[PDB]
Design a binder for this molecule. Structure first.
Ligand code: HEM
Ligand SMILES: Cc1csc[n+]1C
Length: 291
């Protein structure tokens, strides 16, 4: 399967910076969502789940085709709760009907991270919508109730290595688990709509307790009111993972730099970019624009 990036006709940096600003302006406006967390965390989760279907072996799945717009992927049990990120973006797609679905879902994730004061993420245009029959089947996204060997093995399919996996998981400092979506409940920290390295700090400094929640699932709970998933706590159980966790709890700039590279790579897996294709765009935030 080859998927070649095709820039939307005649579009350039300024067009996509207009779509960025539209998403970012609505993130500021619709602030009440999920008890004032706002839409940013569900939008970086949506960009991860449309990319996380990729399989390196046959180049199926991935962010290129925008296939989450089809019922099979929209109704995947693993995507429960992401309909709220879709409905947030649907106004903006009506306003810029020329951007492809893959591009709009991935730029929403980029915009949310930078607007929640994360690192800049280089983003590239050119994903092309593909037919309903290209939609990957349910079951390619990871279970939460498993251990470190499962996480390592699952992420080899998206060929991410240990460092990349640990840098990507730092995004679980954002938002929260919702019992009616996943059977898990609670936030992982106090700053859950500002991008920081707090996931790593909480993992190493809190007093975790294995408890059973109302959906009868086990999760790691702390006195402070935070929770960690079994696959999250996995990172301090494995010796290779645990020493990268310590590296990111001791250096927030290295965390930001490595997250930026692994999230771009995540979003680009499966796509062939021609050598005459434009460079990756670095978008300015509303704040850097005085907007
Ligand atoms: C083995 C890996 C992973 C598993 C099992 C997993 C699982 C989960 C689960 C069960 C939730 C709760 C969903 C809900 O109830 O609403 C969640 C939320 C979230 N995850 Fe993951 N995740 C994984 C990796 C990642 C990665 C790599 C990213 C992003 C780079 C990510 C970003 C998020 C975000 C931002 C949320 C919060 C959503 C919200 O607030 O609504 N996840 N994760
Ligand atoms: C807050 C959250 C959602 S999924 C994992 N964590 C830590």
């Amino acid at each position: 399967l080859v998927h070649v990036a095709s820039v939307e006709k005649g579009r350039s940096y300024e067009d996509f910076q207009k779509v960025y600003n539209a998403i970012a302006l609505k993130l500021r406006e619709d602030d009440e969502y999920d008890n004032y967390i706002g839409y940013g965390p569900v939008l970086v989760r949506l960009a991860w789940h449309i990319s996380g279907t990729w399989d390196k072996h046959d180049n199926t799945g991935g962010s290129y085709g925008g296939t989450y717009r089809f019922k099979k992927e929209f109704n995947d049990p693993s995507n429960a709760g992401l309909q709220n990120g879709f409905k947030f973006l649907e106004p903006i797609h009506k306003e810029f009907p020329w951007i492809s679905s893959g591009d709009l879902f991935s730029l929403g994730g980029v915009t949310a991270v930078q607007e929640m004061q994360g690192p800049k993420i280089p983003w590239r245009c050119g994903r092309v919508d593909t037919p309903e029959d290209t939609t990957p089947d349910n079951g390619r996204l990871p279970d939460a109730d498993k251990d470190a060997g499962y996480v390592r093995t699952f992420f080899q399919r998206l060929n991410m290595n240990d460092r990349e996996v640990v840098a990507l998981m730092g995004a679980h400092a954002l938002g929260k688990t919702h019992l009616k979506n996943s059977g898990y409940e609670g936030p992982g920290g106090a700053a859950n709509n500002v991008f920081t390295n707090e996931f790593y700090l909480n993992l190493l400094n809190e007093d975790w307790k294995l408890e059973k929640n109302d959906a009868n699932n086990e999760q790691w709970d702390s006195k402070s009111g935070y929770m960690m998933l079994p696959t999250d706590y996995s990172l301090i159980q494995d010796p290779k993972y645990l020493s990268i966790v310590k590296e990111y709890a001791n250096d927030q700039d290295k965390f930001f730099k490595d997250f930026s590279k692994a999230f771009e790579k995540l979003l680009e897996d499966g796509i062939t970019f021609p050598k005459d294709a434009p460079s990756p765009f670095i978008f300015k935030t509303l704040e850097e624009q005085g907007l």
